[PDB]
Write a protein that binds this DNA or RNA. Structure first.
Length: 49
RNA sequence: GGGGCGAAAUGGCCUAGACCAUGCCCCUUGGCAAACCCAUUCGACCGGGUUUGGGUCUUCUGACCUCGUAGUCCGCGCUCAGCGGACUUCGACCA
């Protein structure tokens, strides 16, 4: 068992490499941008003709 | 029907921009003020119709009553009427 478990953990080690790589990939700081608009108005006056 | 708008109320588009949907802004013109007419308790009774409504001389151009609108010099004096008065213009059934 002392040798089998050691072999097993040594074989498991590489997978932790790509797992930590993916973890780091999840922390990549990226983003986009947002942009909006708006408009308000007001009548001034009016007369007949 | 004829138009307007993307403004303005929001929704697509929505650095920005210009277009879209419902969606919202107006016309359905209006007024004449007078004179006369019906059937009848053989007028009281409301409603309708006709002739006029700035106006004439040649209302053709153009002028003669009237005014309205302006611009220009104006008298500080000359003419019997007097006066405050001159010249040029456009309009004249009414909003």
């Amino acid at each position: 068992v002392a040798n089998g478990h050691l072999e097993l953990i040594f074989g498991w080690l590489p997978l932790i490499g790509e797992l930590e790589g993916a973890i780091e990939y999840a922390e990549l700081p990226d983003l986009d941008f947002i942009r909006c608009h708006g408009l308000h108005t007001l009548v001034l006056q009016s007369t007949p003709w």
